[PDB]
Amino acid sequence: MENFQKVEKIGEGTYGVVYKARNKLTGEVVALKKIRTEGVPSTAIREISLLKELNHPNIVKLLDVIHTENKLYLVFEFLHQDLKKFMDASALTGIPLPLIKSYLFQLLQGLAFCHSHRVLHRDLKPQNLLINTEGAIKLADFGLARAFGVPVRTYTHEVVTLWYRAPEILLGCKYYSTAVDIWSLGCIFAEMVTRRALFPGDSEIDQLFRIFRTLGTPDEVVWPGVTSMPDYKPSFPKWARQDFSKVVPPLDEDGRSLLSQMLHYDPNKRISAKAALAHPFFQDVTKPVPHLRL
Ligand SMILES: Nc1ncnc2c1ncn2[C@@H]1O[C@H](COP(=O)(O)OP(=O)(O)OP(=O)(O)O)[C@@H](O)[C@H]1O
Ligand SMILES: [Mg+2]
CB atoms under 10 Å from CB of 120, counted, come to 20
Domain extents for the chain? 1-80, 81-293
Cα-based distances in Å from 284 to 96, 151, 251: 14, 40, 15
Please state which architecture CATH assigns to domain 81-293.
Orthogonal Bundle (1.10)
Sheet architecture: strand order including 62-68: 4-12, 16-23, 29-35, 71-77, 62-68
Nearest to 66 by CA among 13, 154, 1: 1
SS (H, E, C) the chain: CCCEEEEEEEEECCCEEEEEEEECCCCCEEEEEEECCCCCCHHHHHHHHHHCCCCCCCECCEEEEEEECCEEEEEEECCCEEHHHHHHHCCCCCCCHHHHHHHHHHHHHHHHHHHHCCCCCCCCCHHHEEECCCCCEEECCCCHHHHHCCCCECCCCCECCCCCCCHHHHCCCCCCCCHHHHHHHHHHHHHHHHCCCCCCCCCHHHHHHHHHHHHCCCCCCCCCCHHHCCCCCCCCCCCCCCCHHHHCCCCCHHHHHHHHHHCCCCCCCCCCHHHHCCCHHHCCCCCCCCCCCC
- Are 277 and 102 within 8 A, CB to CB? no
Residues 6 or more apart in contact with residue 25 via CB below 8 angstroms = 3
Distance separating alpha carbons of residues 4 and 20, to the nearest angstrom: 10
Tell me the one-letter amino acid at 122. Answer: R
Distance separating alpha carbons of residues 98 and 196, to the nearest angstrom: 19
Torsion from C-alpha of 179, 15, 160, 248, nearest 10 degrees:
-40
Distance separating alpha carbons of residues 117 and 139, to the nearest angstrom: 15
126 CB near ligand 1 (under 6 Å) = no
What resolution in angstroms does the PDB record give? Answer: 1.9
15 CB near ligand 1 (under 6 Å) = yes
Distance separating alpha carbons of residues 239 and 174, to the nearest angstrom: 26
C-alpha 89 to ligand 2 mean position (Å): 19
Tell me the one-letter amino acid at 3. Answer: N
Distance separating alpha carbons of residues 192 and 90, to the nearest angstrom: 10
Sheet architecture: strand order including 81-82: 81-82, 129-131, 137-139
Cα-based distances in Å from 285 to 106, 171, 244, 279, 282: 10, 36, 22, 11, 5
Cα-based distances in Å from 29 to 17, 23, 39, 66: 16, 6, 28, 16
Active site residue 123: yes
Q: Which of 88, 123, 181, 243 is catalytic?
A: 123
- What residue owns the CA closest to ligand 1's atom 3? 78
Q: Which ligand is nearest to the CA of 15?
A: 1
Please state which architecture CATH assigns to domain 1-80.
2-Layer Sandwich (3.30)
Distance separating alpha carbons of residues 244 and 160, to the nearest angstrom: 28
Q: How many CA atoms lie within 13 A of 287 on its CB side?
A: 9
Tell me the one-letter amino acid at 247. Answer: V
C-alpha 5 to ligand 2 mean position (Å): 21
